């Protein structure tokens, strides 16, 4: 893809985090084929002397005693000499991958998790605005994880993102309202996070534990750790966290109607391990947030649609109550503009344009019509940045940053064209987005930026986006004209 940031194969880095152990077994005899270099931590023996051995001769008696439920369920609690561990199974590269990580220590964890689930599934939760929904999600995730800072991060259209809501302990700094470059979470990371919706970095300073051997022998490349809970993350990102002053990180993908909408990101100033089952409990909260957002967004759409139908009905009542069509539209200007949330409208009903509200002058409208008549757009054309595709009005963002035009005839140049002014947006970037990384000379290593301090810019010449209800209202108004 675009940048070198996009090319690092983060699922093939060949390392795991030091708090866990990984063992990959092959074939009917379950012969050990890949093992983490720290595996004496739970095997009692030097791991390289166990490659090739069958599983019953490798694993502790305690784990073997749980093999049946492990195989059947893919996840069991095992009590080892080192303490309680969560054992996890998944498949990768034709191997059965066993991961062990420290298990949840609080017996009441799930009871606590059900309580915070209540806050987010409540009778009419999200009734103070979706902002209160986002805040509740940040608060409950922080309560359940104990992380110092929890942020709701939304991806915008160009895949840069912004923090919409933040929950943090007293005294902490935060990132509320700040924007971050798309390269902060590159394309292959976004792809992985769409398929694997949870990731924990327990200690941003710890060194990775390598796998032995360093390739899957049948493949000649490292074991695919795409679905591994212990996967050590990109070194560049660990440097990013260090530059942020973050010692531990945990994030959850927000998947809303199938697409990666954002993340809930958690930061801790010191190392912090969250158990597998506590992370899965937090995943319920994030799934609930996504459901609540969808329910409220669709509710808003349905309400907006009803308002547009009502406007069309009120205009039909106004019509035929006397006067020509032109007289009615002039008198009902406010309703005609509200159909599409516009500031002005031009009607070309056969002669010169009828200009209602704030529009460009007659000359500029007539020139725009002659251009629209050449364009390919079936029945409706819309843009929120007219100046990029129609230079004659590019300096006129005071009245025509956005347009929504509908055809009123097959071949003839008869249109209704609604206009919108620009909405300037002053945004704070977390660091200078003109320097989103610090590459070494030669451009072969790359480091993250050193500074996340606010850097201000104002986005101009773009209107509010045209909503689905705006487009439907315009289609429905065509029949009246
Ligand atoms: C040239 C490449 C760069 C780069 C690579 C990179 N970042 C990755 C993971 C990642 N980044 C973020 C970003 C944020 N964390 C926050 O708190 C905020 C806003 C407040 C942002 C924008 C996150 C959340 C993550 C996921 C991991 C986590 O900590 O939760 C990855 C993938 C790491 C992996 O192996 O999974 C890569 C490759 N970051 C850059 O800045 C440039 C230099």
Residue numbers in the entry: 9 to 489
Give excerpts from the publication:
The reported structures are of a SaBphP2 PCM in the wild-type (wt) and mutant forms determined at 1.65 Å and 2.2 Å, respectively. This is the highest resolution structure of any PCM construct in the wild-type form to date, revealing the important intricate details of the hydrogen-bonding network of the conserved amino acids and waters stabilizing BV chromophore in the Pr state. The wild-type protein crystallized in the dark in the Pr state in space group P21. Crystals grown from the PCM constructs diffracted to 1.65 Å resolution at 100 K and 2.1 Å at 293 K. Given the high resolution of SaBphP2 wild-type structure, we clearly observe an intricate network of waters and conserved amino acids which stabilize the BV-chromophore in the Pr state. This network includes residues from including the PASDIP motif in the GAF domain and the PRXSF motif of the PHY domain [Figs. 2(c) and 3(d)]. Interestingly, not a single amino acid from the PHY domain forms direct contact with the BV chromophore. Crystal structures of the wild-type classical SaBphP2 determined at the highest resolution of any PCM to date reveal an intricate network of hydrogen bonds between conserved amino acids, neighboring water molecules, and BV which all stabilize the Pr state. To our surprise, the dimer interface structure of SaBphP2 is different from those of the related classical phytochromes such as DrBphP21,50 and RpBphP2.8 They all have an extensive helical kink at the dimer interface that is absent from SaBphP2. In the SaBphP2 PCM crystals, subunits A and B form a noncrystallographic dimer.
